[PDB]
Structure 1
Amino acid sequence: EGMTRKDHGDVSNQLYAKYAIGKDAAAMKAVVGEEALSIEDKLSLEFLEKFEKTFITQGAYEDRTVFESLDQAWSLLRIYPKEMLNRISPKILDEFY
């Protein structure tokens, strides 16, 4: 703490696992179509596009402090319910969705 937060470790687990699943979902979408896809895969897809286009993407002269990064992370993960978030302690999950 004091250059990180406590909630840093749990989040690192949620975002990596969800992201991986997001890549797998993109391939499945191309095959099944948009009007025949799963709910769980649909969520994973939405996450892939936002994750890429907000978390990873930053501007040339835009500084991303670690505290700043962690907030953007909660917006992305929010789309999943609490039921699908679980590599996060319920303590954290209740603080920040």
Structure 2
Amino acid sequence: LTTAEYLAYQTERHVLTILTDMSSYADALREVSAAREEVPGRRGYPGYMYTDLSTIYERAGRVEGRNGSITQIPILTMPNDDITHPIPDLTGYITEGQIFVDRQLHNKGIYPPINVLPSLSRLMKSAIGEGMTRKDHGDVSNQLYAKYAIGKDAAAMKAVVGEEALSIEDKLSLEFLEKFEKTFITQGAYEDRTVFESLDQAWSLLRIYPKEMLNRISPKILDEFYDR
């Protein structure tokens, strides 16, 4: 991070930083803190691990005078695939959103096995928008998220109550989910997509529903684009 700071703020160039195993960093912290006896924190991690990590994650962003920036993408490995573990839990309160990688999608041969439901990007709503992307970028994502959740709930319901108990919304949502996970997320390891191509490919799916069932989407947007 010191090298990145020097390059970005005293040489005026755009840097991108990657940190592989913050878990293997917290582990060393725990070991050294256990060497010298101390009042342990949760699961034996030191109490000040939050303020230790904050000093790492909090070097980023632009500054008024310079024309450089630093972007951080620290990889991280949850021990038992739970966000409740102290490391990911604390890192959730310092960074701005996550990019979850899920085991179940991976088992089904889906790449990248990203799970969008628990992911987040707290700066999306300012980086997207009219004059900087397509005007509909702020509603397609919301609609897709809502329908993904509804279809997931329907699929959960099918187990103990049977398909016949499903309703028209649930009849459509399973199809939407099964085509979504297999078409929109699935992507080669070298395939490159621009934002516009992805937006069109997403509009393709939403045509499955009739206009009246899309309610998280603006009336004006639904008219200029749904007809194509």
Task: Tell me if both proteins adopt one fold, taking TM over 0.5 as the criterion.
Answer: yes
User: Are the aligned partners of 2:154 and 2:166 in contact in 1 as well (CA < 8 Å)?
Assistant: no
Deviation at 1:39, TM superposition (A): 0.7
What is the alpha-carbon distance in structure 2 between the residues aligned to residue 57 and residue 41 of structure 1? 23
Aligned-residue sequence identity (percent) comes to 100
Query: Aligned with 2:211: secondary structure?
Result: coil
Q: Which has the larger radius of gyration?
A: 2
Q: CA deviation at 1:35?
A: 3.8
The number of aligned residues is: 97
Counting helix residues as a fraction of each chain, which structure ranks higher?
1
| Larger CA deviation: 48-57 vs 87-96 | 87-96
What CA distance in whole angstroms lies between the structure 2 residues aligned with 1:3 and 1:49? 32
Q: Deviation at 1:83?
A: 1.0
Superposed displacement of residue 16, structure 1? 0.7
Structure 2: unaligned runs, 5 residues or longer: 1-129
Once the two structures are superposed, what CA deviation does each residue of 1:24-64 show, in whole Å capped at 9, x if it has no partner? 11112233333442111111111111111111111112112
Aligned to 1:62, which of 191, 194, 210? Answer: 191
- Could you tell me how far apart the structure 2 residues matched to 1:3 and 1:50 are? 29
Q: 1:65 to 1:3 in 2, by over 3 A?
A: farther
8 Å Cα contact 1:3-1:66 kept in structure 2: no
For structure 1, which segment, 24-33 or 65-74, has the greater mean C-alpha deviation from structure 2 after superposition?
Answer: 24-33
Q: Which runs of 4+ in 1 moved over 3 A?
A: none
Q: CA RMSD in A?
A: 1.6
More relative contact order in 1 or in 2 (CA 8 Å, sep 6+)? 1
| Structure 1 unmatched runs, 5+ | none
